[PDB]
Design a protein around this ligand. Structure first.
Ligand SMILES: [Ca+2]
Ligand SMILES: [Mg+2]
Lengths: 112, 282
């Protein structure tokens, strides 16, 4: 009678690469997930010069399950996703979201 | 209608791309200038006050500091921007240059900062538009997808092959087929010894000992090497073509540059590399 265990676990990619940045991740959403308006609100909450109501950011953090998580970048156009810095337990919770396609460890890039 | 112009003397990379064969003639010739075209330089930023860009800096985006001005504090992005569109050192001397700062003052950044820059350009670019990515790293599905989505939005993306003397198909975004992946050559038409190679390249351009702008003063210059220096020659040539054909799709821009490229002149081009060197009659 207690509900079955969740069967959701997004792939977690890139942790083994030598250029992986510890504790930092790119969460990528599936294209069929209705995450766009929440992401747009989170991006707007970071936009210079723009006044935004508190409720939009608070709602977006709830919709995406990012309360308490340190969201650094928000993607809406080149990608649907966020860049976050979270501890292991929070990472495990984000992987249980069925809207998440995969999560990649952030990686260092260099000028060529 | 415009009239053709002659720059003489010209730095060797520009000198090479307006002709089929060696020897160099000390001259760079062009008709179009890239006027009305928008080049988004995804790099360390641009020195906004450089004389090479006077009056032609457009709005940008700083992924390193929210709301920052995207000024270059390293030099790499200014050098790259100078090859695209500097009055003296540039292919497209009338292009608008937009600084998209995704690397810090040491030339280092992250996939997350690069993707943020690509996200900003995809959302806010003005057509006709081209992105220059003189940077890269390990294989990344997220970074490859962001590049593909910029291309699908109608923005040509030109990327450096990398400097490992290895197959470019191992790295992002060099392995993205729909991007124009650029290898580097020397002034005597050899593939530069460091240039990545292989089936993921689209063509070669000058990349060894390239002279361009630098960030330390409004008139500073530097001479450096890398596939990061070859890439902006191609971005500049794309901007010239886009002035002639402002509604061209990325596929059409690539087809035109590959049709016009000089075939079979790159020595030691590497296993499975297309033997094509940038040529501009624009
Ligand atoms: Ca010449
Ligand atoms: Mg290609």
């Amino acid at each position: 009678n207690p509900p079955a265990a969740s069967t959701q676990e997004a792939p977690l990619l890139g942790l083994e690469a030598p250029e992986a940045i510890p504790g930092r991740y790119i969460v990528v959403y599936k294209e069929n997930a209705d995450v766009l308006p929440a992401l747009e609100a989170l991006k707007a909450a970071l936009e210079p010069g723009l006044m935004q109501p508190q409720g939009l950011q608070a709602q977006a953090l709830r919709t995406l399950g990012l309360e308490g998580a340190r969201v650094d970048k928000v993607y809406t156009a080149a990608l649907r996703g966020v860049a976050v810095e979270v501890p292991d337990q929070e990472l495990a919770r984000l992987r249980q979201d069925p809207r998440v396609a995969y999560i990649e460890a952030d990686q260092e890039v260099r000028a060529f | 209608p415009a009239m053709a112009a002659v720059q003489s003397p010209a730095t060797w990379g520009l000198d090479r791309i307006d002709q089929r064969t060696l020897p160099l003639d000390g001259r760079y010739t062009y008709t179009a200038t890239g006027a009305g075209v928008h080049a988004y330089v995804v790099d360390t930023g641009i020195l906004l006050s450089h004389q090479e860009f006077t009056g032609r800096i457009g709005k940008g985006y700083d992924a390193i500091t929210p709301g920052g001005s995207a000024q270059d504090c390293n030099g790499h992005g200014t050098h790259v921007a100078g090859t695209i569109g500097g009055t003296t050192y540039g292919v497209a001397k009338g292009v608008t240059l937009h600084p998209v700062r995704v690397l810090d003052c040491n030339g280092s950044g992250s996939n997350s900062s690069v993707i943020a820059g690509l996200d900003w350009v995809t959302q806010n670019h003005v057509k006709p538009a081209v992105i220059n990515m003189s940077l890269g790293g390990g294989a990344s599905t997220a970074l490859d997808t962001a590049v593909m989505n910029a291309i699908n939005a109608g923005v040509t993306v030109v990327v450096a092959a990398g400097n490992d003397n290895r197959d470019a198909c191992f790295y992002s975004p060099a392995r993205v087929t729909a991007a124009i992946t650029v290898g580097a050559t020397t002034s005597t038409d050899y593939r530069a010894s460091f240039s990545n190679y292989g089936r993921c390249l689209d063509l070669f351009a000058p990349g060894q000992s390239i002279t361009s702008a630098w960030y330390t003063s409004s008139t500073a210059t530097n001479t450096i090497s890398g596939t990061a220096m070859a890439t902006p020659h191609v971005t500049g040539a794309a901007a010239l073509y886009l002035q002639w054909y402002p509604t061209a799709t990325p596929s059409q821009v690539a087809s035109a540059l590959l049709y016009y490229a000089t075939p079979n002149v790159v020595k030691n081009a590497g296993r499975y590399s297309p033997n094509l060197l940038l040529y501009t009659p624009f």
